[PDB]
Amino acid sequence: MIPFEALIPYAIMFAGFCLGGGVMNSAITADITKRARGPNQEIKRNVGED
Amino acid sequence: MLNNLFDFIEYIEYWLIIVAFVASVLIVVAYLTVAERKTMGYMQRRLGPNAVGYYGVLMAVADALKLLSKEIVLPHNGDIIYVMSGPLISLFSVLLSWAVIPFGPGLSLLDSEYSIIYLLASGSIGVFGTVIVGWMSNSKYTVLATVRTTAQLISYELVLTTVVFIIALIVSSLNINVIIESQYNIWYIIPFFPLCLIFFISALAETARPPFDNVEAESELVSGHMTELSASPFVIFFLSEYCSMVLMSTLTAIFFFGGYLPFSNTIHHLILNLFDQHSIYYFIIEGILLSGYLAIKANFFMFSFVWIRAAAPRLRYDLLILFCWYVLLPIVFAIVVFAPGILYCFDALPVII
Amino acid sequence: ATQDLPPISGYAPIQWKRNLPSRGFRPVIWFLGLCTATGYGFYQISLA
Amino acid sequence: YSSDLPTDIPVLSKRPHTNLLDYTFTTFDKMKNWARKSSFWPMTFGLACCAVEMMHVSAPRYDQDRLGIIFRASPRQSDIMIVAGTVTNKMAPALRQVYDQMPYPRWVISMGSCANGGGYYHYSYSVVRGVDRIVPVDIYVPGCPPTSEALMYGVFQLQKKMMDGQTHRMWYRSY
Amino acid sequence: EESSESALSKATKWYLLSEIFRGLYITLEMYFRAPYTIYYPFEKGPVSPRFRGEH
Amino acid sequence: SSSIQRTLRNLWKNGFKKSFKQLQGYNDIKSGRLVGTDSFGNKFYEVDDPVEIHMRTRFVEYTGFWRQD
Amino acid sequence: VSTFPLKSDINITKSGKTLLSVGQGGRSSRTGFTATVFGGTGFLGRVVVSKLAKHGTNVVVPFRNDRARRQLKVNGDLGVVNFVEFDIRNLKSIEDSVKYSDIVINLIGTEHFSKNFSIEDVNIGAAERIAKAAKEAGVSRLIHVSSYNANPSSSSDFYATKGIGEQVVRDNFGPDATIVRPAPMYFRNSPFLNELLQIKALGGNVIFKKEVYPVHALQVGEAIERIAFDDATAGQTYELFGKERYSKKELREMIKHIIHIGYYPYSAGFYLPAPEPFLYAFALIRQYISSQPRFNVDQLKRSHINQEIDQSAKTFTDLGMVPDELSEYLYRYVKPHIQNRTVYSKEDIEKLRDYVNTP
Amino acid sequence: SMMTNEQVFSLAVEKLLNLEVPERGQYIRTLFGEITRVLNHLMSVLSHAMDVGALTPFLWGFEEREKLMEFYERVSGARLHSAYVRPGGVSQDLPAGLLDDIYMWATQFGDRLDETEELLTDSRIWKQRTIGIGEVTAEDALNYGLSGVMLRGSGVPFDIR
Numbered sequence A: 001m002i003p004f005e006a007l008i009p010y011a012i013m014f015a016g017f018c019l020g021g022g023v024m025n026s027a028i029t030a031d032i033t034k035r036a037r038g039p040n041q042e043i044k045r046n047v048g049e050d
Numbered sequence B: 001m002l003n004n005l006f007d008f009i010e011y012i013e014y015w016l017i018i019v020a021f022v023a024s025v026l027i028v029v030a031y032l033t034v035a036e037r038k039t040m041g042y043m044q045r046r047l048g049p050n051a052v053g054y055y056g057v058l059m060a061v062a063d064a065l066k067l068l069s070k071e072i073v074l075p076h077n078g079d080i081i082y083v084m085s086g087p088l089i090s091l092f093s094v095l096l097s098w099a100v101i102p103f104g105p106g107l108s109l110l111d112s113e114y115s116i117i118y119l120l121a122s123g124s125i126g127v128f129g130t131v132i133v134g135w136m137s138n139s140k141y142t143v144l145a146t147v148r149t150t151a152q153l154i155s156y157e158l159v160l161t162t163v164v165f166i167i168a169l170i171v172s173s174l175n176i177n178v179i180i181e182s183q184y185n186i187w188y189i190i191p192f193f194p195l196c197l198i199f200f201i202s203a204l205a206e207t208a209r210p211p212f213d214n215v216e217a218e219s220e221l222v223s224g225h226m227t228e229l230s231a232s233p234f235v236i237f238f239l240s241e242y243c244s245m246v247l248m249s250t251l252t253a254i255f256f257f258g259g260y261l262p263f264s265n266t267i268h269h270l271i272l273n274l275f276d277q278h279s280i281y282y283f284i285i286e287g288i289l290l291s292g293y294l295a296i297k298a299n300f301f302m303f304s305f306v307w308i309r310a311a312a313p314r315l316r317y318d319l320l321i322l323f324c325w326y327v328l329l330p331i332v333f334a335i336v337v338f339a340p341g342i343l344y345c346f347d348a349l350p351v352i353i
Numbered sequence C: 001a002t003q004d005l006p007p008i009s010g011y012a013p014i015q016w017k018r019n020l021p022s023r024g025f026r027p028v029i030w031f032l033g034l035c036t037a038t039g040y041g042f043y044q045i046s047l048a
Numbered sequence D: 001y002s003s004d005l006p007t008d009i010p011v012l013s014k015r016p017h018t019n020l021l022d023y024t025f026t027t028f029d030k031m032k033n034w035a036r037k038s039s040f041w042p043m044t045f046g047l048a049c050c051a052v053e054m055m056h057v058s059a060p061r062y063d064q065d066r067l068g069i070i071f072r073a074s075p076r077q078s079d080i081m082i083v084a085g086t087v088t089n090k091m092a093p094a095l096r097q098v099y100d101q102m103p104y105p106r107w108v109i110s111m112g113s114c115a116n117g118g119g120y121y122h123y124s125y126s127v128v129r130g131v132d133r134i135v136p137v138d139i140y141v142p143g144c145p146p147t148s149e150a151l152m153y154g155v156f157q158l159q160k161k162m163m164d165g166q167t168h169r170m171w172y173r174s175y
Numbered sequence E: 001e002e003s004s005e006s007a008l009s010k011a012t013k014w015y016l017l018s019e020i021f022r023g024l025y026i027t028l029e030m031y032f033r034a035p036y037t038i039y040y041p042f043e044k045g046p047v048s049p050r051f052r053g054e055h
Numbered sequence F: 001s002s003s004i005q006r007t008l009r010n011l012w013k014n015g016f017k018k019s020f021k022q023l024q025g026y027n028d029i030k031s032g033r034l035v036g037t038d039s040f041g042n043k044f045y046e047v048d049d050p051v052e053i054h055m056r057t058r059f060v061e062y063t064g065f066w067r068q069d
Numbered sequence G: 001v002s003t004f005p006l007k008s009d010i011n012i013t014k015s016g017k018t019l020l021s022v023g024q025g026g027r028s029s030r031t032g033f034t035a036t037v038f039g040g041t042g043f044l045g046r047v048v049v050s051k052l053a054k055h056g057t058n059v060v061v062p063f064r065n066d067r068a069r070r071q072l073k074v075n076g077d078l079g080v081v082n083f084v085e086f087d088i089r090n091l092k093s094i095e096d097s098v099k100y101s102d103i104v105i106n107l108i109g110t111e112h113f114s115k116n117f118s119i120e121d122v123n124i125g126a127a128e129r130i131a132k133a134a135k136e137a138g139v140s141r142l143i144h145v146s147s148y149n150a151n152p153s154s155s156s157d158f159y160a161t162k163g164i165g166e167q168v169v170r171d172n173f174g175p176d177a178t179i180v181r182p183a184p185m186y187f188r189n190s191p192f193l194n195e196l197l198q199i200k201a202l203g204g205n206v207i208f209k210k211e212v213y214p215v216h217a218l219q220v221g222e223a224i225e226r227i228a229f230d231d232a233t234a235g236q237t238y239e240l241f242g243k244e245r246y247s248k249k250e251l252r253e254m255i256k257h258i259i260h261i262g263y264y265p266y267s268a269g270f271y272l273p274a275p276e277p278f279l280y281a282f283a284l285i286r287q288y289i290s291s292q293p294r295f296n297v298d299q300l301k302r303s304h305i306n307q308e309i310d311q312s313a314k315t316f317t318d319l320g321m322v323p324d325e326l327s328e329y330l331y332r333y334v335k336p337h338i339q340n341r342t343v344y345s346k347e348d349i350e351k352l353r354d355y356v357n358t359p
Numbered sequence H: 001s002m003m004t005n006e007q008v009f010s011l012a013v014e015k016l017l018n019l020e021v022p023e024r025g026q027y028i029r030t031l032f033g034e035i036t037r038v039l040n041h042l043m044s045v046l047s048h049a050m051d052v053g054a055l056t057p058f059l060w061g062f063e064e065r066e067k068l069m070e071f072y073e074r075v076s077g078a079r080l081h082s083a084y085v086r087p088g089g090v091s092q093d094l095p096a097g098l099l100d101d102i103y104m105w106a107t108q109f110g111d112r113l114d115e116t117e118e119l120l121t122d123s124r125i126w127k128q129r130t131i132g133i134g135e136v137t138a139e140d141a142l143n144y145g146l147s148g149v150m151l152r153g154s155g156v157p158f159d160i161r
């Protein structure tokens, strides 16, 4: 008889790690990539059609 | 505006990451306290907190807010230095010790080949924070838990330090990220199972958790050092004990259960093939997955912190100091002369690739 | 009848002696399992 | 000087909410009181047979912890004093000292007939005829001993009173 | 010299915490059992006709 | 009596608003046959669920929402 | 205190009420009276309520601070101390505070003003409305409390409203209303001995040059007891004070040695001298920034005024009580803020006075 | 130990009264003389373990106390201070169906003791807290008048039953 009410805090602690990790993996990757696109801000932001 | 606001974000982006990091740790710590009572409640046929917020979700909120709005008891009105300084050292050390834990490959605030030393050094500052709480007090119960507190943390620090160094010896690196990646083909719980029991036993003592509970023993020394703590000094010191629980549970996952590595490489591969690597949606899923593997491994040990508390009677202090010196330390030095021998015999001395 | 009484044939016997049967393998087998895991573990460490 | 003092301003527990700053201070009151109601940490001051029923409230069947009630062994960490048992003359000065050491806000519950008014030992040479001769008592739980549900009804009644407090709206209006 | 257990058996139980791991396991059995708690004041414990309460 | 199946079945039988009230004061999602209502307005149910534990086969639904006496 | 607060067990009031006391004067005894202490949750009210309830006199305590009144009940037996919620902007409540009473006491007053009440509304408006309602409620005796320098011509707002407050009472209740003008009352947790012990006293030299006469808060409480229970004190004005003259600058320094507090008093901020135009400015700002009663502008003017004794009024010898000197009571009220413990008797304290003034 | 307390006053007064309880009354006082003994040790053994550190075994047993206090209340009307045993016998007869509840509790209660002996009897931490602690010699126990279990622990086989 698995108690789901007992495991509610763990599913929230699982989300705590995922929240921090999901942000760090994506935000740092996006920033590194964007600054590696060109030497000015009008290049970094926009994506060319070609 | 739209061009003079984007650069505002790019000038504030790395502060939002840190706040998301701090919130990530505090959410785990806040809901660790509930999970401790919810779990230990169901092993005692109770229910645990389920009345403060739907199913007790807002239980840490109420306890923290209740104590944050209590009257702080200072020996004299302007003695805020004495009450706060003890817990403040403890909180900063364990919050700074979170700076080396990676949630994925490279996703840690501090990355340096001396991460393991930084982690052991930071913890020893917290030890200094703990003994200071009682050492500025005349209460007999509070000042009782300094000489016994000091040696208990001193004695099991050698055991915890040596175990970390044996794992660092097997990979020949004092970097947290290198240790995790070194466990791809094997998890160090299989070769070094005895060290994991020794690591977990030592981890309990360092956080003063039961059965190594003699510092803050309610039946013995009431609240220990906290019998003179109330309102904010109680929460900050209480928060520190649970930041360490989350940390030391994560450290056991890192050193013996592969850290953020997947339980199955196939399931990891199949899940990620549903997302395109050219869109930022792929990297959110990987970060959620990689922290998910760590979270599940870490949760199992935060579970075991509570689980052992509900199953083992408290261990007597005099028999507690002799345990780490006359039993654990010889074993830990025996292995540290054993692992280099096996590695050399098969020409397998480690190098940092 | 008109009082609280046990049945005619009485109640069935209950369990009151100690019931703690031991569980798990022999202690030697656990030690063999430990030295198998240690041996295999250092095989995989030495391989990598 | 000049004082234009009205006569029709309702007393604080009756005053309806009119402007926005009433709700702002009311919300700060509800959030503050909700936390104090939910983190109802008493102090383990069991003295006699009334304490046995106090422990049974924490037993699995009733499980006071499920409501956020954790018995604390120190006044510093406690805000509720539960007098569970007979208050003798010899114990009386200690009870006052323990009471004075509790930081505000604090509430006291009197459980059972001994604490309430002496009870069976009302005509004894060594029993205080009611703990309300030593400390202020916020609610009286009747019984010998009060059942576990009777004690929980007393705790529930006090929480309803704590949620009715207006500590901060009082400053904005009564002060 | 009259201990039936061999040296290794006594030390495997000692080093691997034989009875403690069992003690944990029995506690974990309770985790998958129905608790006892009743949700007063929405439910009440049993009462009998002989009960003494308010006069 | 603690499994999420027991909470799922009771959640569906009551519907949202009845179950949301129990998720606010009762802390548990239960469903039972209605037995009667008293002079104050409280309604008293009886639980037929074969898994419900010994002392939890009867309960009340108080008239108020945020408070119960 | 003693064992019986009365001189006789039958006491007839101005209204023909015959009150017969029963018992020996302990907790279970009664006096037949029924007082109403306004502001009984205040500093002076707690001592006054305690003495009345200690001897079985029913006391109605109107309150506004719900928690601050709880500790009042310990002083009286069952049914003795009664609580009536009230607000001076509500009339019905005050007309119920005095409905069944036989004595009305008015300790309500302020030296600070707030966003909801000014000093004019409290020292004058409240006392007037109390006396008007206490008269229409058939109360035999009213006792009022004002400041020690009640003078409607004072430039200070506190003594401006306190002086006018005396008139509007006798102009409302009548020529029977007693009046009490206590000196600065010192006691445990007293507002007077507090600012003398407060460490970071900003503008110390500006504030502590004011000279007063110390007086025991208990004697003021016991004096109010004798006044209510005696009908020969109706319409009389009492000026309650001590004999020996003390200056706050003397006290703030005599206290300093008892506290035992070299470099530290200067570094810790014990001395914080201040130009007066700044103090008038900072105390000006905290009137609308601080949410708590801070040392305000009007209190600053009082520091320029020493205590005045209105010699046409009465003293403790009228009550047959010897006034208590601060010499014998200063020490026991600083032990909370305080080898061998250093105990100061009357001789020790007087010698300590000599050292402060000696250069 | 509420009912055994009032059993020693009943025995003393009946002894002075030269009276003897009828047969059924004596069985009821033995039946509730042992229910009370189980109630006491559940309170004593398990709170003793709680001081030593074992929090959980306390909670398991105190649900048995709730189940046993139900028998106290069903016969007398009070969970704790049942004035049931009196000089001359007991207050009232047993209610119908009480025997069938004492039995149904008795079938299961044996397993409740085993789960207590699981966490404590063989635990090395429990045996470190107790073995060699508070030793009493038989000569010392008889001199200080130690009785009950703190006299049979010292090896003397004496029992007042």
Ligand SMILES: NC(=O)C1=CN([C@@H]2O[C@H](COP(=O)(O)OP(=O)(O)OC[C@H]3O[C@@H](n4cnc5c(N)ncnc54)[C@H](OP(=O)(O)O)[C@@H]3O)[C@@H](O)[C@H]2O)C=CC1
Residues within 6 Å of the ligand: D174, G038, G039, G040, G041, G042, G043, G044, G045, G063, G064, G065, G068, G087, G088, G107, G108, G109, G110, G111, G117, G122, G145, G146, G147, G148, G182, G183, G184, G185, G186, G190, G191, G192
């Ligand atoms: N050393 C001293 O204390 C001296 C004081 N006095 C005067 O004696 C009088 C009594 O003051 P004291 O007891 O000593 O100390 P406090 O200043 O604390 O007493 C003030 C009393 O008046 C009440 N009060 C003020 N404003 C209101 C209001 N709007 N509505 C209802 N009640 C109000 C207060 O109620 P609440 O507590 O709930 O706020 C309090 O009970 C004062 O007028 C004071 O100026 C004169 C000489 C010496």
Ligand SMILES: CCCCCCCCCCCC(=O)OC[C@H](COP(=O)(O)OCC[N+](C)(C)C)OC(=O)CCCCCCCCCCC
Residues within 6 Å of the ligand: C022, C023, C024, C025, C026, C027, C030, E012, E013, E014, E016, E017, E018, E019, E021, E022, E024, E025
């Ligand atoms: C495998 C990884 C998980 C377990 C790790 C720890 C192993 C402990 C046992 C070895 C020590 C020892 O001494 O083992 C031997 C002992 C004692 O045997 P005995 O009393 O002589 O048996 C009597 C005679 N027989 C052999 C005929 C029966 O057996 C045990 O107590 C087994 C305990 C099993 C339950 C605990 C495991 C579950 C814990 C949580 C897992 C998630």
Ligand SMILES: CCCCCCCCCCCC(=O)OC[C@H](COP(=O)(O)OCC[N+](C)(C)C)OC(=O)CCCCCCCCCCC
Residues within 6 Å of the ligand: B194, B195, B197, B198, B200, B201, B211, B304, B308, B312, B319, B323, B327, B331, E014, E015, E016, E017, E020, H124, H125
């Ligand atoms: C070679 C393989 C290496 C394996 C390394 C592992 C060793 C671990 C310790 C074994 C020694 C021992 O348990 O010792 C017991 C010691 C000291 O006992 P003592 O004073 O010597 O008396 C007994 C021995 N006599 C009679 C021979 C002298 O105290 C204890 O009860 C410590 C119990 C700690 C339990 C903490 C909880 C566990 C949490 C982790 C699981 C969830």
Ligand SMILES: CCCCCCCCCCCC(=O)OC[C@H](COP(=O)(O)OCC[N+](C)(C)C)OC(=O)CCCCCCCCCCC
Residues within 6 Å of the ligand: B061, D030, D031, D034, D163, D164, F066, F067
């Ligand atoms: C930095 C800090 C972060 C925030 C901290 C969180 C604090 C927890 C919240 C306390 C809740 C509480 O107390 O909810 C319960 C309390 C007390 O209800 P009562 O005593 O019965 O009176 C209230 C009921 N009446 C007056 C009608 C009798 O109010 C309530 O019923 C609030 C009812 C309206 C809620 C509207 C919420 C609007 C949405 C908010 C989210 C989107």
Ligand code: SF4
Residues within 6 Å of the ligand: D048, D049, D050, D051, D084, D085, D086, D111, D112, D113, D114, D115, D119, D120, D143, D144, D145, D146
């Ligand atoms: S009131 Fe009754 S149950 Fe409570 S302590 Fe007194 S005698 Fe015991």
